[PDB]
Design a protein around this ligand. Sequence first.
Ligand SMILES: *[C@@H]1O[C@H](CO)[C@@H](OC2O[C@H](CO)[C@@H](O[C@H]3O[C@H](CO)[C@@H](O)[C@H](O[C@H]4O[C@H](CO)[C@@H](O)[C@H](O[C@H]5O[C@H](CO)[C@@H](O)[C@H](O)[C@@H]5O)[C@@H]4O)[C@@H]3O)[C@H](O)[C@H]2NC(C)=O)[C@H](O)[C@H]1NC(C)=O
Ligand SMILES: [Cl-]
Ligand SMILES: [Cl-]
Lengths: 535, 535
Amino acid sequence: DRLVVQTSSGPVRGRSVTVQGREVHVYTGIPYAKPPVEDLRFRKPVPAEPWHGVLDATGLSATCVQERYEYFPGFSGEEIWNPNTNVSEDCLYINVWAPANGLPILIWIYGGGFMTGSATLDIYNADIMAAVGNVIVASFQYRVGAFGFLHLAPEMPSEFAEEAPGNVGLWDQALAIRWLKDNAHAFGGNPEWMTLFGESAGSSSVNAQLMSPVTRGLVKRGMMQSGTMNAPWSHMTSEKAVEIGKALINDCNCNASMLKTNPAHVMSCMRSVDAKTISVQQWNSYSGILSFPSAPTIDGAFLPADPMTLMKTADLKDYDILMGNVRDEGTYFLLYDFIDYFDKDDATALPRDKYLEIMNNIFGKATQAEREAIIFQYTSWEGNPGYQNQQQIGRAVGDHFFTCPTNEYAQALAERGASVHYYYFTHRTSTSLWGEWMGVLHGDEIEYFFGQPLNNSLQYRPVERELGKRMLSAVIEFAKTGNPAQDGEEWPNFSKEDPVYYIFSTDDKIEKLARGPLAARCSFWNDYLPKVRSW
Amino acid sequence: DRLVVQTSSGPVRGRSVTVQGREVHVYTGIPYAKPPVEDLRFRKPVPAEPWHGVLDATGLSATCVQERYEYFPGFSGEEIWNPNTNVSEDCLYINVWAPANGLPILIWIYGGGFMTGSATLDIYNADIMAAVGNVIVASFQYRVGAFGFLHLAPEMPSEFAEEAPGNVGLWDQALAIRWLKDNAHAFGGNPEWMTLFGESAGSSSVNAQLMSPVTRGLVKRGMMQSGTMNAPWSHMTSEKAVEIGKALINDCNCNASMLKTNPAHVMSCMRSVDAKTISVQQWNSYSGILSFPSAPTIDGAFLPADPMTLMKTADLKDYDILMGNVRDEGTYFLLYDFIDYFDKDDATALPRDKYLEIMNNIFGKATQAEREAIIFQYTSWEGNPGYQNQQQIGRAVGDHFFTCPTNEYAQALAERGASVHYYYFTHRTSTSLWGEWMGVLHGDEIEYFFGQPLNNSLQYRPVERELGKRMLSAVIEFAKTGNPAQDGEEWPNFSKEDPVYYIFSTDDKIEKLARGPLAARCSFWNDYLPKVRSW
Ligand SMILES: *[C@@H]1O[C@H](CO)[C@@H](OC2O[C@H](CO)[C@@H](O[C@H]3O[C@H](CO)[C@@H](O)[C@H](O[C@H]4O[C@H](CO)[C@@H](O)[C@H](O[C@H]5O[C@H](CO)[C@@H](O)[C@H](O)[C@@H]5O)[C@@H]4O)[C@@H]3O)[C@H](O)[C@H]2NC(C)=O)[C@H](O)[C@H]1NC(C)=O
Ligand SMILES: [Cl-]
Ligand SMILES: [Cl-]
């Protein structure tokens, strides 16, 4: 069977697909760890015991346990982020796309705030990327939610360290990535030619996999799409995670208080709560939009320090980073945690009642000083009263939570020596089923970097297919060379001294290279606001 | 002699001028007080003793004592603000323009920061205004500098109150204005139809004459051009003025310390210092650009409270105010107190070295909190690095010192009931001999409101003559009706609720009525910065 690869853990059988002239053998569902169930819930992953028969790697994996958004029933645009397959803890599986010293390897880490996401959503279909880019794309489920990130070792004696260390979702990724290096050659790939790439929490996970002392050196080439660990939603102190963790582990009626005189009876209890109940109970430590109960946790291990402290010493000499943002980052989340105020589909005339309403809630955790500074920075006199006030909050959240943290991380990375290219995705895809006011939603760049516009069975305007064509190629070229730039197309490095970024759109009369606008927007958050925080 | 008017103090003979079809009898040099010399230096004005023969009112008055700027030798544009006539304390004279129940009376108060200025500069020639507007224009010298504003009564016993009360320059104006009401009919005018109008400190002086309990009711119709008493350069506490005054009165080697055991030997000393030496010594208490040693002083008399406290109770029911600003207010003064950094004529690429340089000096008297807030509010990323940084300081000073104080005063006035119309002068006159980067200098609106474009012996573009035509007419129509608006031309009142302003320019494709831009610029100074001043 030419559709069989013998992996380090056994032969596997995949499917053949012919995309765009190339044949691709797509193997989905390869286990890379023991199903982290029963005893192994909350623990680091153990590698999968090898199998003998040819494993059926044609079915899609099961999706890691998570709840699913349905603030818009039926509305496809929401369910495309919801698990398309059965949800079970049995979810630690790999997917590998291999075309028919080895091809380059792109490993996809999905996003979803360490709380959601699956490698199997069709948005993540790597068929076109593998065929067109002639590269090996892999992906994999990692444990998300409390299943991946519950952290309680500080509250337990030393012997119980491996009971709930935290970050096992990242360890999962580490393991999956380690699995892929081992089996690179067996699928036709160069194990040293590996490239991580991901979006949001996936983008952040790429980040962690690149920086972590646990994994460092495994791969020094990463693409991060709107997700950096310095962002507030993408890192979390140990002591916070223990508070969240202690809440959940009696939110689940498991005591949580004897965690240190007789702990893992608390665990044994948490080992026998149904997953669905944790999958819903975890969210009650969520409020403060975009501060989820699970995050890369400073743990003395995978994340030994705060990300920016880690950056101070890291020397990223040989690292290639391709990172960026989409124009209207924060607008997907504004619609979600303030659906009370905003419409799915049409714009909102937001008043000033409702503007301070919303701004003051989002930022209550900050000084009145910087609260007022933010409110004034995102006041819009010249805009159509209302529409421009709604639109200015979507900027505020887009800026504070995504663009400006990754702008900051991008500058820190280049300072440490990494070769950083920055992109800004500003095209609204013609089939955006979201409200036009939300413009370029967070995640809208995914399908473009995967080359989905090239899918002639998907109605995209012609020059949108040329934007996919280009965006997909920048990812391939990056993976191949560390440099997303094309021939005769300039796209120089992004440094603090020259924070130039490429702009992907399909207006062919904008300046492709730009520096000013992003730097201005992020000067507020990254330079000025820190000064306001002086009491 | 048909060119003779018998005034309350004597017959006077003027000249006939035929301007634009009308004959105007222009009487310059009528005394309205005793020359405030010798004993009367620093004191309130006494009315002029009457004369018998027909007084020669054809010569121009002598200009009140003041020094003169010559940071640009020969360069006419500077000397046009310098005294065109002999400078002497003998300077308290009136000028009256009368065309051949009485015509309306416009009284012109010149500006110059209570430190400079003369009613006789040709810029202030009211020939065209009188003829075209068929109105009586009057003007008059008031004592400026230490001669008009030295304030020492608090430091003296009660008996010495009238020795140096402060504000005698304003009392001068009060007297001159009182003189003009008395002799209104004798020149062909309606004494009740009076209108004050002035520019900068003149604008502020109009303000004071309208609000002062001393003069209030005398005239309730005023035009204020870029000068309101709430502005920092236009009011000053008593205790500050005493410090300044005590400095000058031994800056002039007159002891200053025995001011309260045996004072007016200090005065007698100051009564015998040559005027020129005070005229130069007064300036050594000047530094901090646009905070002059003389200002309307809170004195318990002419200015009984801070201007904004006075506003809280004033009820301006029957007051008509026509006020406004020019586009680049602060740029004349930026060139002056920072000539080290900026060229007379061409723009300056200002660095960021030099940007914080300049901003930090201007505003040292403010918290680091608001210092930084200002620096960030006037940072320009998208502008041509340099030019836009120079240009952004000229805005900062234009805004803080003129536009936004008068914007604030304008709102306070309307709240108290005054009928306020607001204008914004944005045309750069084609013969601006200043650097193009300074755009619309402070004072550039004067010659336009006086109708000087109508002077066919002065080369102005055709539509600039239509801007003078219009600006002059708005002043006449205001004086006649309290409303600068024309027929079929909308120009509604300016209130805090609808801070709409008319825009004078000669691009006929701008929106004449506008609200947003000024309100945005002044929101910083008038709303946000006060909040930053909370420690
Ligand atoms: C371009 O755009 C197209 C339009 O959106 C898009 O379309 C479609 O292709 C997908 C996959 O090729 C179709 O998806 C399901 O429907 C198929 C038939 O309609 C199903 O057979 C299949 O289901 C099941 O197949 C999975 C394949 O990975 C697998 O998880 C399971 O089973 C399989 O394999 C074993 C052994 O080979 C068999 O025994 C099973 O029968 C099964 O085949 C699972 O049970 C597809 O998941 C979809 O319907 C197509 N149409 C539409 C409208 O979506 C393209 O994918 C886009 N991409 C490219 C590159 O063209
Ligand atoms: Cl080919
Ligand atoms: Cl006529």
